[PDB]
Design a protein around this ligand. Structure first.
Ligand SMILES: COCCN1C(=O)N[C@@](CCO)(Cc2ccc(F)cc2)C1=O
Length: 130
């Protein structure tokens, strides 16, 4: 229905706002663009499913996310890709892992504080019905 399409547009507007707040945070600058194959050719071979905040904005605009649960899976992937590719005892690696964990924790805390559980439940029920 038109009503359900309005509900999904509402969800996309909220997801664009959360993603913009993460992308302007100086800590998360490394997560704002895909890894440049020139600089890191080792990456696309170690990392099977690359994800960054620019690509998240792309997935929202293409209607790939119908639930907050769907969105958070891609946040979790940004974080899990950084921890798996930078596991070394080495300050540079420790710094990116701390920032990746802070990105994940921030996104979960915004959604916990701001979004009503009944709105997510609604978005899920429309998804399941299709
Ligand atoms: C927006 O769509 C979901 C409906 N909704 C919520 O889930 N929490 C609030 C308030 C509780 O009523 C607040 C809020 C407003 C705008 C948002 F983008 C996000 C959250 C709300 O208005």
């Amino acid at each position: 229905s038109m009503q359900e399409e309005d509900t999904f547009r509402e969800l996309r507007i909220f997801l664009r706002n959360v993603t913009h707040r993460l992308a302007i945070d100086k800590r998360f600058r490394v997560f704002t663009k895909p890894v440049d194959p020139d600089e890191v050719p080792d990456y696309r071979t170690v990392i099977k499913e690359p994800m960054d905040l620019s690509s998240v904005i792309s997935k929202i605009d293409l209607h790939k996310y119908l639930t907050v649960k769907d969105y958070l899976r891609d946040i979790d992937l940004i974080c899990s890709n950084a921890l798996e590719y930078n596991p070394d005892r080495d300050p540079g690696d420790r710094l990116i892992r701390h920032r990746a964990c802070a990105l994940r924790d921030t996104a979960y805390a915004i959604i916990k504080e701001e979004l009503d559980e009944d709105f997510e439940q609604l978005c899920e029920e429309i998804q399941e019905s299709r």
